[model samples]
Target: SKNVVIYADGVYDMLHLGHMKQLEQAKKLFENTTLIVGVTSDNETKLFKGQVVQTLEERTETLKHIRWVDEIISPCPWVVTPEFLEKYKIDYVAHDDIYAWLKRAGKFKATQRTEGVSTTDLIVRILKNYEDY
Candidate 1:
């Protein structure tokens, strides 16, 4: 059987429960999920996100610690190019947008939205609360 590889690319600068839940759901979608969790390199993060506090080592470590993750790949530069996708023989790229489309098409699996907070919201909260300090 071909790999049910799931490609999720983001800075993952600040790992949180939302991310954990997403990965958890991703794993449940396939028995042998390659889980190609891509962490945007520091250079790319700075270029796009303006600031990247977590070093590659730290980011990689955080990903590795996730029980749902099977493998981790640190891609240089930025973006998940088609070439990269072709190389992995990716079966499905588990993105929220893709999930939405599948649902609309009535081809999505049944999975519960386990309770969890969003990483972005939490990040914003922290920034606002402590920026003045």
Candidate 2:
């Protein structure tokens, strides 16, 4: 064994602590690893994960500051194809269980899903406290 090359993709809508933890989880999953993070495009976020609080550029710029991340793959495709694996040299797909395809391929791993912290939850908090803000 050589070093592990892990890919952790996400919407990173609000750039919250949960996002940071997810990256950290992937980064440290192995003794020796390189974490490559994927930041989807704006239209992809609109189509799947719903409306985003920040633009693609904003999210990408934010991810760039995460020290453990070895590389940033922007406008990354939602699906991990055979060509992708060969092209990106991705040894494993690390996420919160969205790597079902890779799981069957025996190349998927996962980490815990943080509780009570997300963009939608943050939105609810703001909406519920409209009286203060």
Candidate 3:
């Protein structure tokens, strides 16, 4: 049977509930779906963000334990292209209402982002209460 391959790429540095929510939403899109997660490399992450709390290996391990996840792409690309999809046999890319290219290509599925929770939120909380943790 030809399975629907859904791609989801993220930093997933903290591996919070928001990430899980997004993955769950992706899985809901189709039956016999293979959810492939692309975990950004530390180098790639630092280009757009600050210091990474978790390494690529650590984040990969964390995501591997999730029930909904089928596979992971370590050091995944930041940009998704037609060739990328073709290489991985990906049918759709699942994410929040953010990307224009994927939508234009008709390969985007909008996932609901969790409210008031993110890697940044957790970082801020840690910084604000450094002494407590």
Candidate 4:
């Protein structure tokens, strides 16, 4: 392939800065790379990730503004199959929650998540204090 295709995806919970960092790191993997940021479907997010603060459409549309994202794909599968890779022509996958099969296939690259910016962390912050609204 002329240009490497990197596939990274998630719920984009609140479209946090962690995502921006992750995508930037993924984009920097190679000099020439196409970063495809995939957004999981609402049904999938509900099952895997708990209730979301934004709609699926909100998440998808918001992701388009990221500079590192060369393109945006919606409703990505929670599990990335070989078929998905072949179809999308993805040479590398960037995400921490990668499936075992993808890891074994030597296609997964882990991006260090940012600290104290995740949606869960946000919720915990407010509840942990139990005083601030």
Candidate 5:
């Protein structure tokens, strides 16, 4: 029988609660699901986004340990392309509802984001309380 594969990709720099929450929710989207997570390349992230706390290899290694992730695609494209969806036989792409652009992909499935928890929030806490630790 064919599989129902769900694609999820992110920077996953800090590997915090928010990331875990998102992945868990993605896994719950379908039965006998194969969650294919894509880790963005450090260079690509640096060019388009801000500096990442962890390197590409480091992020990949961290995600590999997650129980829900069935496969990992390194250096994933910033945007989900039709070719990618066809190549992987992905039924849908999971992402937080905040990313409006993801909806334009046609295969996008908006997933709920963890309230009051995010990589940015963690970073802010660390910066604000540097001496507290």
Candidate 6:
């Protein structure tokens, strides 16, 4: 059977090339893998990341349009519970350190070290290049 790979969580605030490429790369890493992306809620983003740049509807719309995304889980706060893992039969919990820590501590199945680009830095550059209002 094909592996059900899960990218634990992300903001997906402003979809860009960096995000696209990250998903592409992830797919390449696991053949026949279903890409499950968990979207962080706006309230959760504000509380944890100190920023809420996009609404849940916008985030969901952006992800739904992506061809590489096989499924999406919404209203995901700062944790990926064990129940989630069991429900999805997730073969690997792939995400950055913050999520990796929670997924690991939860004793849920985890890969702990999914790699990706510096999207935050790219966003910073875009902001820097924009003209003042």
Cα RMSD, each candidate: 5.6, 2.9, 3.7, 3.2, 3.8, 5.0
Top candidate when judged by TM-score against the true structure: 2
TM-score of each: 0.67, 0.84, 0.83, 0.84, 0.80, 0.69
**Candidate 4 lDDT, tens digit per residue, 1-133?**
3799999988886888888998999998888999998899998889877887788899998999889999888878877789989999999998754367888888888787878887778888778867756
Give candidate 2 misplaced runs (Cα > 4 Å): 119-133
* Per-residue lDDT of model 5, residues 1-133, tens digit only: 4567899999999798878889988887877789999999898899988888899889999998888899999979887777888898888888874445446656677677666686677668888866765
- Cα lDDT tens digits, model 3, 9-62, are 988887888899889889879878999999988997888866788999999999
Candidate 5 weakest lDDT stretch, 10 residues: 97-106
In candidate 4, list every pair of residues with a backbone clash: none
Q: Which has the better TM-score: candidate 5, or candidate 6?
A: 5
State the lDDT of candidate 6 residue by residue for 1-133, as single tens digits: 5675755468888777667766665555556778788888888788878776679989889989988888888866477666777777776666535455555564333332333444566667779878887
* TM-score, ranked from best to worst: 2, 4, 3, 5, 6, 1
**Local error of candidate 5 at 24, Å?**
0.7
Each prediction's Cα lDDT score? 0.69, 0.84, 0.87, 0.86, 0.84, 0.69
Quote the positional error of residue 1 for candidate 6 in Å. Answer: 6.0
Name the Cα RMSD for model 6: 5.0
State the lDDT of candidate 1 residue by residue for 54-111, as single tens digits: 7988888899999988877785437555566678765565655535654564434443
User: Cα miss at 1, model 5 (Å)?
Assistant: 8.5
**What is the number of backbone collisions in each predicted candidate, taken in the order shown?**
0, 0, 0, 0, 0, 0
Clashing pairs in 3: none
Q: Report residue 79 deviation for candidate 2 (angstroms).
A: 1.5
Model 2: pairs clashing at backbone N, Cα or C within 3 Å: none
TM-score, prediction 6: 0.69
Q: Evaluated with lDDT, which candidate comes out highest?
A: 3
